[PDB]
């Protein structure tokens, strides 16, 4: 049931892992405790589809508090995606960064935040400006 | 003395009122709204009775539909639940696999079944056979 | 839109 979903989530084909993560946030849409499947959708996160990465960012922000220790499995993936030349995918990470509230994470993400503070495109810089206040919401003195 | 009888849905949708006490419609719409709210805000191990404002208010869930009575505070309680269940039996008798949607539809005879069972707030036929017999004969009278 | 339009000037110098 969820394991068949985790079977499609640990699939190698894109069309199976893409429909799997849609069912997860549809299970989250209908309000199911899908927090138990947390680090398994994290495996199908670093994907070439930008349309799909928003669903995981939706999940990780929602279940950051629920799985605070398991949330250490995204820090490398954020600093990976703060550097991709699409400004859409960089600011998408940045707003995912600051809204995820785990104090085990916020110390690591200040440097790609500092990187995106001095970015080029106005799009991510107006996004990175708010993430500072998101960080100051989480840890004021670290800012 | 049964003061009134209420049958309201899982959504609280009242499928029957029968006021054996004469209180006006605003008071009917007030009191009915409160007790539906009371019973739906009440758990499954809460003794099937409410001491509601000098009425030992009897509730007994059987399906999605909920059930309600207001007995006088000198009378029996489990039998009052059995009164519901005997009436449940008579609804189970006259219908058979007694079920929710013709409570919504054929309620008119469910009043008539109550009329063959409880008039004045009390029982007139303590048999379960003779009462549904009489309503079939009046149905055979049509 | 069953009603019809009317053309205004451009400049009105």
């Amino acid at each position: 049931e969820i394991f068949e979903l985790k079977a499609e989530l640990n699939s190698d084909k894109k069309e199976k892992k893409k429909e799997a993560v849609k069912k997860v946030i549809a299970s989250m849409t209908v309000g199911k405790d899908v927090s138990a499947l947390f680090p398994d959708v994290v495996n199908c996160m670093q994907t070439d589809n930008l349309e799909l990465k928003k669903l995981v960012y939706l999940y990780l922000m929602n279940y950051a508090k629920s799985q605070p220790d398991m949330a250490i499995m995204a820090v490398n993936t954020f600093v990976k995606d703060c550097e991709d030349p699409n400004p859409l995918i960089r600011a998408l990470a940045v707003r995912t960064m600051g809204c995820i509230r785990v104090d085990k994470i916020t110390e690591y993400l200040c440097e790609p935040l500092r990187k995106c503070l001095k970015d080029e495109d106005p799009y991510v810089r107006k996004t990175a400006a708010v993430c500072v206040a998101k960080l100051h919401d989480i840890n004021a003195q670290l800012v | 003395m049964i003061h009134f009888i209420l049958l309201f849905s899982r959504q609280g949708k009242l499928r029957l009122q029968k006021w054996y006490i004469t209180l006006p419609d605003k008071e009917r719409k007030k009191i009915t709204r409160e007790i539906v709210q009371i019973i739906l805000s009440r758990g499954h191990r809460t003794s099937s009775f409410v001491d509601w404002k000098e009425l030992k208010l009897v509730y007994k869930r059987y399906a999605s539909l909920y059930f309600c009575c207001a007995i006088e505070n000198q009378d029996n309680e489990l039998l009052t639940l059995e009164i519901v269940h005997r009436y449940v039996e008579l609804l189970d008798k006259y219908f058979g696999n007694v079920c929710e949607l013709d409570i919504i539809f054929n309620f008119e005879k469910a009043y008539f079944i109550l009329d063959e069972f409880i008039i004045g707030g009390e029982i007139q036929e303590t048999s379960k056979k003779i009462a549904v017999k009489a309503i079939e004969d009046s149905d055979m009278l049509q | 839109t069953s009603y019809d339009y009317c053309r205004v000037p451009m400049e009105d110098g």
Binding site: - | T46, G120, S127, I130 | -
Partner: protein
Amino acid sequence: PIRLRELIRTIRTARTQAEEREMIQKECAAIRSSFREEDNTYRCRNVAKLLYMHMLGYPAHFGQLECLKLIASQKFTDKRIGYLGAMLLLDERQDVHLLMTNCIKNDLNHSTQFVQGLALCTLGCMGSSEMCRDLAGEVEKLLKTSNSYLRKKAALCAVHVIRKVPELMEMFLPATKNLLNEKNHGVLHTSVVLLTEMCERSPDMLAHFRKLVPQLVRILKNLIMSGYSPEHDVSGISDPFLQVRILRLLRILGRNDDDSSEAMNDILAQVATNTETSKNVGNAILYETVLTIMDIKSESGLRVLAINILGRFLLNNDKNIRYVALTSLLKTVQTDHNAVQRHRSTIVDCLKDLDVSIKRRAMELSFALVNGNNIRGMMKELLYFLDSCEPEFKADCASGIFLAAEKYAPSKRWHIDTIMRVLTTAGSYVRDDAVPNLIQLITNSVEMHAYTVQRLYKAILGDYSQQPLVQVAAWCIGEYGDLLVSGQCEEEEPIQVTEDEVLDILESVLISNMSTSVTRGYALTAIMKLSTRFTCTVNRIKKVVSIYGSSIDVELQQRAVEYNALFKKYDHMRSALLERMPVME
């Protein structure tokens, strides 16, 4: 015109209630317009669709005349619709229901028993007090019949007219004579409920009716010994509905008699042993059996057995039975009083139960369990239980604390101490009605007001927002101010009474918005008394009276100006009427 279920199916498709009202007033107009057509065809269904809207809660005042037409119809189904909504749309205060009186009276003389069954149905359910006066001879006439289909109905209809008209039962004393041998149980049941009613209203009827006590002792013993019938039997228990009503009739009979109480003693000893306590039914049999035994001057071996019945019922995990058992000892508080007191810890256990009604019955029975022996220990549970009440029980407990404390207080000081404890911890939960009672008992108290008013002063500096707390305090400061500030006309060594913060704390109430203005009603009353109860600093309090003469509360604008002229013109006549109030009961 569409059918009922076609309408309901359309109503079941309604999503928004406002949208549903659109569907209501859609069909309701056609129902109205059909009524303007004076239709007899669809008048069956248009009323039936209307009563659904009435059950849906919609103004269906208009079709009530058509119901009178349906009662005054000739087709049986139109009557079958017509008698129904008469019980629905009409009540006694409907005031248009009086036109049924002729129609029912003709239809009490209808050939069909089912039409007469409809007439006895509608009058039995909602017959008005004057309609009961206008149909009384016909009901007993249909109680003099032999039709057990009608005898079961005219009996309960006779209850209704005796219920509605209490001065009417004397024409039913001859009606009820010797029909107690009915082979049918249902007619025999309604006769018992009638004899339950007849014995209920008049004590003068008891003499005629306690005679036939051993008649039904036999017939109830027939119900125990006829252990099965294909009808009346639920779970192997034969006609339990009749059996309880006999016991209830046997409960109200013999309750101050002994010979009938001994005429019923045998079957009481029987069914206390000869019941099946497995199902819910035999518990319901045995519950009334307990209550029948407690209320009559019974055999002592019944009552000792009956507490042992209840000791079982205290320990059944069915919360029904726990509600049953707590109600049972709540009934027989005074009767067999100390066999209840040995079940005390079971009652303190049910204070920690997770049901409202169980905690309700336990708290109130604990209010009933207080004698002058458990007064010290149980209150400490109860004052703890007052802390562990729900806010619905906090109002209920704090009053019921005050009730039993006024009964059985071993001390007057400790009586004060617990009340002062409750007034600190109830606050917004203790009722304002007990405040003149608490004020009365502390002036029924005569000896500890220096003990009282200091402790009154020591908590009101904590807060004022507990309004029934500060209702109590301001009268005590006005009356027993001399015991608060004592010999301190001028400044002395600093004791906790200081006769200025004493005056400031009442002044703090007068400006604070969290004042019920009878707080401020008591406060100016206390100000004006401390013009006499204090000799220390008066005429600074005259300033407070004088500035309050422009106040916005009407009486508190009266109260200040009516005080102030004594403060300005009749300063010697201020103390000429400030003698302490007398003490009453």
